[model samples]
Target chain A: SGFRKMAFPSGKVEGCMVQVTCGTTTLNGLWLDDVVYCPRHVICTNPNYEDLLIRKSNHNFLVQAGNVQLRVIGHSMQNCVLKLKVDTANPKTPKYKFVRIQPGQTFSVLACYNGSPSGVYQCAMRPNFTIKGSFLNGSCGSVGFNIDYDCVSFCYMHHMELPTGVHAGTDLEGNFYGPFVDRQTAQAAGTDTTITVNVLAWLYAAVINGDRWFLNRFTTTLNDFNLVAMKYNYEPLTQDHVDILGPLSAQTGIAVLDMCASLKELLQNGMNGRTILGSALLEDEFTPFDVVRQCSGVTFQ
Target chain B: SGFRKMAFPSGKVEGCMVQVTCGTTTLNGLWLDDVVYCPRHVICTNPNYEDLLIRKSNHNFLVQAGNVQLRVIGHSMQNCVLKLKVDTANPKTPKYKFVRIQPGQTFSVLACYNGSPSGVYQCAMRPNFTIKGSFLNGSCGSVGFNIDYDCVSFCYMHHMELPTGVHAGTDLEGNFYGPFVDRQTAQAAGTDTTITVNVLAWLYAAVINGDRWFLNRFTTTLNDFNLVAMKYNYEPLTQDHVDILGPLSAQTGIAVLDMCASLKELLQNGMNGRTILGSALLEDEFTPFDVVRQCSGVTFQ
Candidate 1:
């Protein structure tokens, strides 16, 4: 009856004249411009969760210079080896470092924000955007994962290569996706204000470092927030999740439950265990004599 | 050793000559202007856990217009009333309200971003900062329960007066008051320091009775209520916690509430104490301090 809401978060294109209010509906009714289809189904916890907590241990990160990649949260962490440290300066004039996180690994962190993607056609991107990569001894962080589609239904999942009119839903844990077509074929498939953002901050570092043969070939059927069927309601992903996830999410994303039910917020928010302190993969910004000669056991130099 | 690192968060006095590495120590040494103390000791799941999940429950909120206060996340949420709807304006523009939180209740919601306190002696705040109010029928939401002090003996706990050799801590769940005496009596209380910030912020809505116990008259003090016992255990405040949070933690300063063991990291940092949609009790080029309210809220005419 009475509207006018916009401060940010319609995926942002200078706040693409937004209005997205799903639950009762308002995916852009009487005109506003920037076509945004708000679809959220959310209902997860099908069970057996192994990851989804990246940024959980201890905590204090001010670390920001560049070349980042630090993921460690497999839960109760096994394997061994733990020394990884970095003070960067200021502990009574103590330029710090200790280095070492193998065994239960997860490094490749060149991240020093002390400073500052990919693809699949209709890449669009917007909701909290970020997804960059570079490593040949150089590392970078920004696992954004893309989602928010539309290029004529991504030209048609690239020619029914995957956008089969976007419809499917099964429960227990089988098929899960719907709502890419109707809404006027994704608001007449983009006229401009695309404002995408459906790769939620590296969906828990790609389910603790992805690539179980690309989750049994191409994101377990374009996703319904399926952690390959709720963390293995379908059984997939392993290498002890890659020595505890080193090339994190080994590339992950594609319609994570249309971009936000995140497994019914994992039975109502349950995994943010946080433990990061790992580093090394250099390309820039890192010194304590360059993270004890590129992180990996140095006994403090 | 290695140096040259800064990007913000030494309590922003221009990232206040940063470098605070704990777990190995670094409470400011070898000159750095803004003295930041690094004290950490976290171990929660002390079990029990209740309110630390604000900004949860079936998502979808773009509600920014003003007139705030909307705290519903006590867990399992009982007492019912159900018709508290608010699509603000889209779901075809609906916005109903039957109001009935009651039993264990909590509701002041006027928050329409959905924008956005008090105190006493030695309150030199700096960690997170926030606290504000207003509502006879005007409602407002900016819980301002943010705290984690330290900025040149907190510049002066914002100096309202109890800076006197300040020291206090106690656990069992309540009362923590650290000091302002070190660093040459907070470097002689004040000297060219305009770092500004106080009203460390609401000790758990004054023990679940909030809307103003005005700072602890007796919510029976069981849970944290005072910035994780004002950041890692101390003891003072009780002259009835100094006539109710001593006129508001004596103005402000002291209470790291465990730097970030996060008393539930205010449920993954969502408007700690709650306020989202367009919040701003203070923001000026990035430091518009002081938030007692003129603080943009209330637009329900």
Candidate 2:
């Protein structure tokens, strides 16, 4: 179909990741030729923004960022939960991993408060538009999953990239937020604000650790394609990626992104390393299992 | 709509390049997994087989292998002709290049003979099948570009690879050959024998030098993707191809196989390096011009 290109905030097109949606359709965001193509509108709140505090929010399960803890203040986070983890294997290079959310009692989450019937508070609307910038939410109305969000410029550090294919851009009723942002006019407004490690990397690790809030998984192990593609754009293959993925391919056969269909499939399946590393990684190679064993998760077996 | 796989002779699956055709439709021969897919019939002659002595043949242009010379015994190779060139830049690593054909008159094609008009000859029929063992031919009726066939088992020192995307499986009338070989029964019978240098590499050099008898070109430059793909299949990116293609991509922007659609395109555009080298090779990067300017072609401008 016809696609529209969304403008990127200065210094933000390549690494910043976000979800896009239309009435009922959701698309994994794509950044090409210096332009980000959002199938629909995108919400990038000012940097350092917080997750919307639902007045009395409730969820069956959830994965919260490291900066905040999900607690049952007045409501509930019913089921399971997972959290982000950052590993510093080396001083220069920081690694990202994910851990599971602690199990909680029926009516309360560890540190996050549920709804207080006041609906959601501080759930600021971005772009002065009707769309609220929530961290992210699954659009399952039957389960009452509605995340009134504001912006995630500060979701992780550089940016927040979701690993779950679950649709975001929904309101309290879990309805898709309309008023599609006219891409030409959309701003990178708050595209760069993160606290801990790379969120996308962390969440994907959460996937390996057995988290379920993730939607689209990729053949990517932890490193994202945009991250890699950008690296290869105008450089050499004897480049860095070759160093990281070279022996990785021969020993593990994790030919990343080779499995996933398109750049779209890359986003959806990247968390699980299905994009290119694909069957070769999960099915063919067991090396990654040992690699992921150290991370904690709420429900990993 | 329907496809049939032609079997490979012993060790010929990955690198053996051949042309395939249907009645009016022609397909660049594709070798995948262990079977070669030919749209129509394929004729692979016994090792050491010579080009068929067409009683009397005439052509507007022709490109002959280094081991063989095109002459007018009683026929003609009319216009221009180019021959294969082998360059051992490194004694251990042989390089292939092509040169322009030496010009000749209407009645004399230098070292070759013309037809005796017997419409007969030692044109041995191969296989117990009707397909004769001939080299290759173009099916353009108006140009009188019909080459009586035979075999080029000794086209080079290993196997022959053609740079011309031109059609190769035609009879005296330039009619497409039929009676497709039952892949299961086809053999690599004489797949390995060759002399002089790599013929494919040679003809392709001719392409760079400006020959036109080629068909189904590839995005590949001097080296073939099959050769590279085979090299990288079980290895690393600090892989050899990475070495050659790495600097090439940075300096020339020639991202091999990144264009021209599928592997089929890789074969067709490879001669001109259009497949992957693409516009980058011819348009964006002028580095290749200096490289191809050395080869010879029968009708190079």
Candidate 3:
């Protein structure tokens, strides 16, 4: 027997408002309002079940700031501690802020900026949970990437509290905080946009720093991309997702894009996609700040 | 051989318009206009000596807002660098501004205060010339307490730049910067008045901390208060001086008062007063921030 496949151009099919006719009987399948795909489509005249697959948010991340407020929004399963560390790009060391967030709650903090000029600040964040494989002995056990969630990860460094007349100086050592002379630069540095930019900025720095520990870890986690889609019921990666990760990978290495494409192939081919994506995510090692440090010239020992 | 004593008060004597007879000849000492003291009463009428004595300014010292302007009006033989270190009693660290100053030029630096509240800001000035003892050596040579010059010395600890919304939190070690909950306390901590107060503040904290390094240093220097007068050409220590140093000494120990009194006695007795005061200052130890740490429970090793 052969059957026609449904086509959902918009990735969603809401409300079963059509009629289902079979030989001499007529029936209505109208219970799927604003819901995902309805099994009733198989037996009815419905032909758009494919439209219910929703693409996951672009990598589960968000950054925002307003009126001395900074908020980092993300997804997580357990209520855990979220740490945001910020370091001025100049000579002074960074400052850390700790915010306890319930799973799915937005993490935020308040700050006062003295007249210190600014620049690209190193920024980083780490949620308490990271994906990993769990095992008890050598015996193989149930191994399927579980969904019920999406993972959010980011990193960078920063802080703003400072004195007015004080300028950076060096001790007997030749090292010192370079001049943060321009007011506009300083002001620009203090904004949230700059902070978000620094996240990627430091990521590239880390890559150029010739350090592969984090990048290796990141690539390892790429193996789990297929599992991520299956576990989370996510649609295949879109061009938009690649657009976000594309430039970021360019500086680190083209290998990153290739790995992502490999993960994409696993997801689209309908093979062991869930397990594959899960393994990829679990193998990933780069924290948001790790990328920041590498791209911003803040090398971590 | 009998002559009358002059009675000009207000620590000043001027004008030599009177005539005098040296047995056979009459002479005029009229040329000594605006002179400090007339020699006519001591011997033959003499003239034309103007006193270049400069009085010490009152104890209160304050410099605020604008381009860190430092106007030092003094008598230095050469132009030198004047260092101004300002410590605000907030979560932030102290700021240092160094300006080159000519012998008679007013030193200043332009700075913008970005909303960090203003007040006393434990401030101190150090003219680099303080190190090279200009006079004698050994038995405190050229050390007669000098009341003519006031010496300034100060130093201390600090903090790294910080984040906007983040709050301080304890690490796994359980140590952290406590909440600076009281604005009034932080404000009071910023004043120059608190600095003068901390000279005594840290003295007590030192006593409690069981460290005599700075206190003993201060006391040892106090022993040379008499020479301080000669070295600095300081006018005799008035009751005003005693009043300021008096209460401060009582808090730590009456021993401090005795030291002040010894310096005062030497000043009144016209002994090695200048040299003593000068030596006391030259040998002294304590920076504005040092005192701040002591009194504010910020003990330094």
Candidate 4:
């Protein structure tokens, strides 16, 4: 097995927080013990730009350990439903936490964790918006389980670990998403959009929080091994290209082609600028999440 | 082909860092774009605790990436040599930065990179100490290269990306230690102690820096996938056991017939505790570099 241990070998200590800043608004005070969750896209319309209608989406379940918190920031005209459910298996208690945030507001909540070594937590977000005479209705849900130990204790992110071991999708799915090779090209296809989304959100949280120490370890692993895609060129967008290209490239990576140069320009100025570029004010501003959203679905919008 | 896409789908938007902490001693201000170099253990003459003797050691190398800085902290009886050589590839226009710190001091200096994308930077540190009648003389060196793009650009650190695709060991001897499997039993065989040391150093740096974010990510991967030996039961340590157990555990997960328990106890209290546990005050304080020394060769003290 050519399985290389990507994690740095030590455990976590106390009084640890890493932070990174960009532009005026920065996400700081992030802890490795904490998990950050963000939706696929922030309060965006479906189908058309003017046909703008709020769609409620839910991220499935996830297994998280320790005390987990939920942080949500977005721009909207009305309140959005943020529903959280813990330990679905134990329906006996039927526990759930729900909150509504008015437009132009930020919300952070301590998700309920009953100290279960292996428990599931799921969340769904539904935004309300008016389109012509009808109100749009949609929701997205995400799921994950928690480990008994803090992530830092193992020296890597918990989510990156695979429970079953060496599992790739179906064969045809392989054709669609390519093989899981190196980091850069490994996720060139399939359901990796969410995986990508989850990770991007984690990193974004780290940056805003100025988790430089965490960033340092991450960078060390990469530099020491060369794990990510350094430079890449996409094929011209067309019908055949669409057929071959996976949803990620076909929907988001390609749809954003016209804006790649501009996005790259903004990115060159640094990440903070990019975050600022996607801040409130516009109904359809492109944030880092949008890139993954586009890749996750078939719609070019 | 149970290959799962461990990396999140997106690339780095610009900023990223990871941190881990241990007690009062923390490694902060870490960058994924930066490289951490720690030498193998140094010359020592300890077997039955009474045979412990102080032996001086030296590590040598050249400058690294753009304005790459050097940070060194250790226990020494006298000043240590810090030598840096730049533009070794050019031979002419050579640049060198060298300094010596008195006993009981920490040293940091800006290493010259000249903006080389793929250039090697090696360095050696020579410590001066006393034992009996004569001063022990020894040295160790470590090397690494830099990439053109900053690490966070891809979000997760790179390195899972091998350059030529299938690469293992140095071009010259290819005699260095290979990768490790299970944490508890991975190093049970041969010269994995140094490999273990390298990882431990990386972890120590994260802990002192309070790099929970990075540690969080790491732990996620490990626990989620069962990458390490979990649910391990440590057996009793003995003579032949010492030869095989490699000082981690031989009886139960929490017993140390030799040094495993101490190492585990230090690791158990988070990274900061371990760093403080291995701090200065002794001729054989366990630092990140010590692991490599133990793995490199025989006693050169």
In the order shown, the candidates' Cα RMSDs to the true structure are 27.3, 27.8, 32.9, 24.3
**Candidate 4 overall lDDT versus native:** 0.20
How well does each candidate reproduce the native contacts, as fnat? 0.00, 0.00, 0.00, 0.02
Q: Each model's TM-score, in the order given?
A: 0.20, 0.16, 0.19, 0.18
Candidate maximizing lDDT: 3
- Residue lDDT tens for model 2, B1-301: 0000101011111122222222243223222222222222222223211232122132321212122322212222211111112121111111212111110100000000111000000111122212111111221110111011111121111011122211112222223233322223333222111111112222233333233233343454424544543342211112343343343234334243332112334333443322221111111111122122212100110
> Taking the candidates in order, what DockQ does each have?
0.02, 0.01, 0.00, 0.03
lDDT of each: 0.19, 0.21, 0.22, 0.20
- Per-residue C-alpha lDDT of model 2 across residues A1-301, encoded as one tens digit per residue: 0000101011111122222232343323222222222211212222211232222132322222122322211221211111112121112111212121110100000001111010111111222122111122221111111111111121111011122211123221112233322223333233211211112222333233333333334454334544553342311122343343343334434343432212324333443322221111111111222122212210110
Q: Across residues B1-301, which tens digit of lDDT does each residue of candidate 4 receive?
A: 0110011111111011111112221111112223222111211321321222133222222223223333322322211111122222221111222122221111111111111111011111112211001000110121122111222111001111122121121111111223422112313222111122223332333333233222321222222222221222121223442343333222222122223323343334433312221221111212333222222211110
Candidate 1, residues A181-284: lDDT per residue as tens digits?
21123221111111111112223323322211122222223244344334423222232332332322232333433223543343234334321111111011
What class would a CAPRI assessor give candidate 3's docking? incorrect
lDDT of 3 by residue, B36-99 (tens): 1111111212222122112222111122221232222321111111111223221211122212
Off by over 4 Å in 4: A5-301, B1-61, B65-234, B237-301
What residue runs in model 1 are displaced by over 4 Å at the alpha carbon? A1-199, A202-220, A223-248, A251-301, B1-151, B154-301
Better candidate by DockQ, 3 or 4: 4
Could you tell me the TM-score of chain B in model 1?
A: 0.17
